[PDB]
Amino acid sequence: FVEMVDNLRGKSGQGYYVEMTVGSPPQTLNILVDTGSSNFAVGAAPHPFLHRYYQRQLSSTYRDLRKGVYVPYTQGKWEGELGTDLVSIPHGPNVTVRANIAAITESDKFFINGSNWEGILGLAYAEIARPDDSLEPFFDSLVKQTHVPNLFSLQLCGAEVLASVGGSMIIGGIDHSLYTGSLWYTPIRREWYYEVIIVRVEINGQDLKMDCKEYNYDKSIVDSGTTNLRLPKKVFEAAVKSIKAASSTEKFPDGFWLGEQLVCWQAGTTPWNIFPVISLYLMGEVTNQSFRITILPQQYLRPVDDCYKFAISQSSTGTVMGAVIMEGFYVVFDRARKRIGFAVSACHVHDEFRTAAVEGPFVTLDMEDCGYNI
Numbered sequence: 001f002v003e004m005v006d007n008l009r010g011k012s013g014q015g016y017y018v019e020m021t022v023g024s025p026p027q028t029l030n031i032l033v034d035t036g037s038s039n040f041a042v043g044a045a046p047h048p049f050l051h052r053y054y055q056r057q058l059s060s061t062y063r064d065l066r067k068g069v070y071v072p073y074t075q076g077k078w079e080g081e082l083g084t085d086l087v088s089i090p091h092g093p094n095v096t097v098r099a100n101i102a103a104i105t106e107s108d109k110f111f112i113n114g115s116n117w118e119g120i121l122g123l124a125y126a127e128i129a130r131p132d133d134s135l136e137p138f139f140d141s142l143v144k145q146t147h148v149p150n151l152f153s154l155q156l157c158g159a160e161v162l163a164s165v166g167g168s169m170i171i172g173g174i175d176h177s178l179y180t181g182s183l184w185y186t187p188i189r190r191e192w193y194y195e196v197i198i199v200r201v202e203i204n205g206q207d208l209k210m211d212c213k214e215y216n217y218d219k220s221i222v223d224s225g226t227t228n229l230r231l232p233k234k235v236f237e238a239a240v241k242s243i244k245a246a247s248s249t250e251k252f253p254d255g256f257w258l259g260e261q262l263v264c265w266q267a268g269t270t271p272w273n274i275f276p277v278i279s280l281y282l283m284g285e286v287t288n289q290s291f292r293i294t295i296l297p298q299q300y301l302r303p304v305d306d307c308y309k310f311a312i313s314q315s316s317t318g319t320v321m322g323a324v325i326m327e328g329f330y331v332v333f334d335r336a337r338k339r340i341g342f343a344v345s346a347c348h349v350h351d352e353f354r355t356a357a358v359e360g361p362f363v364t365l366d367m368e369d370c371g372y373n374i
């Protein structure tokens, strides 16, 4: 796994990408690692924010599928042409896969200015692929065509220009040098998104005391392709109220709490201690058990004087455990056993007083009733 360590790079708030090659001879592209989607899709035509793109005509191994695809998001969109080609990950497993590729020919508000990536690697399941679930996602193809074990793990490390970030994507195994302490597993509730169940939330040790259904309304997912911790309205409001109280020693504009305005202190004078830790308790493999991941202000205040943006925001599509949550931790996407594991990362954030943590078990009653019945 030594060759896969530190194979991720990115800019703060713009996602983590891995280097891939597509076609014969290999075309080098940087590809966003995205556990929140299921299409392998790459820019395939000129764009203002693209410094390179996939040129199908230069590839001897490209095969046209004679099928179009249109993919709208809430904020942006892209359309493209479906095909197959040979794909490799230079700092990944020593294998080559014939994968589905959506060649993006037109897009609106999709590509990010300065992000340094040219495509997206959807690592989630076929159920949410476009145009439909018959378009085998990349990881499925990799596992079927090669001997690579059905799992991958992500260590995202995070912290003029936006700060550069790094991490590792370990494909086909778990690298023990990348974490400390125990690995705790939460079940994948359904193979579509990487859906999980949160049973309890605490802010500075204080229970938010909501019906746990609220935490997973209408779902909760683990998503490397989203920056923030996104929370359902009711939970978000209770969360900020508590965070505001803990830090009321100082006062910030509404725009900060809205995740819009930045907030700065003199360099090195960031008062971390006035901000509370946040504990998310995830359902255990055992029915009435859970374990908690505890995250520090260092994670949910994202650097952009030292200037920070509040990286927790309101959602209407359920909880999203985005990059800022994942950054504390080594995260194992154990598809083979339908579970996601968390452990304290070798690159976790910590000051002399507090530290990110993964701790269990804690015993709770009725947590199957915490979900959303499809």
Ligand SMILES: N#Cc1cccnc1N1CC[C@]2(c3ccc(F)cc3F)N=C(N)O[C@@H]2C1
Residues within 6 Å of the ligand: 032, 034, 035, 036, 037, 038, 073, 074, 076, 110, 111, 112, 120, 128, 223, 224, 225, 226
């Ligand atoms: N599936 C789905 C899905 C379903 C409904 C709404 N959104 C989805 N997401 C998939 C694309 C996405 C993304 C990534 C990068 C980027 F520049 C833009 C971008 F929209 N990736 C994630 N993880 O969330 C984003 C929206």
